[PDB]
Design a protein around this ligand. Structure first.
Ligand SMILES: CC(C)c1ccc(CN2CCC(O)CC2)cc1
Length: 166
């Protein structure tokens, strides 16, 4: 069974207006099989709108392409992003971690999604007791995008609610 097509797409902004279906494809085929590759254009002038998308055969290929950023395509650094259910943020809210979850639990789990810069385990302003949620800040938005499309996150035995923050 193939992963849903929506999860295999990269939406690419910042294209050179000279980039074509063919040159976008030749670039991004370096990181996987492309089942689709389109540059968006004006319907009357055919002038590029400056963005397009590609569709890989697997999610691992999307990962490979995203790990190969920055992408310079036809002389211009472009901006690829995956689809989320774009709100481009580097921080997540992690809820449901109760009082026994520590920083290393969150680090050990989330470090495989991306490079962590901040872990903030939330505590009560009056008592100092843990409140049962945390925020994790990464150095880049793709980590967050990968995280929030998962159906499940289990951290320290807890089923966690994870969403984009601010
Ligand atoms: C499916 C197709 C319509 C599509 C839509 C949107 C993008 C990316 N989007 C994000 C940044 C904006 O400034 C414009 C580009 C790429 C492709």
């Amino acid at each position: 069974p193939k992963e849903p097509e929506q999860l295999r797409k990269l939406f690419i902004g910042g294209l050179s207006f000279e980039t074509t279906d063919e040159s976008l494809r030749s670039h991004f085929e370096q990181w996987g099989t492309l089942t689709d590759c389109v540059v968006m254009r004006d319907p009357n002038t055919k002038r590029s709108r400056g963005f397009g998308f590609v569709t890989y055969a697997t999610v691992e290929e999307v990962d490979a392409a995203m790990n190969a950023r920055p992408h310079k395509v036809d002389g211009r650094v472009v901006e690829p992003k995956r689809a989320v259910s774009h709100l481009t943020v580097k921080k997540i809210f992690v809820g449901g971690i109760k009082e026994d979850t520590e920083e290393h639990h969150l680090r050990d789990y989330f470090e495989q999604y991306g490079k962590i810069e901040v872990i903030e385990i939330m505590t009560d302003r009056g008592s100092g007791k843990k409140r049962g949620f945390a925020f994790v800040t990464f150095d880049d938005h793709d980590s967050v995008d990968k995280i929030v499309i998962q159906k499940y996150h289990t951290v320290n035995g807890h089923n966690c609610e994870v969403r984009k923050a601010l």
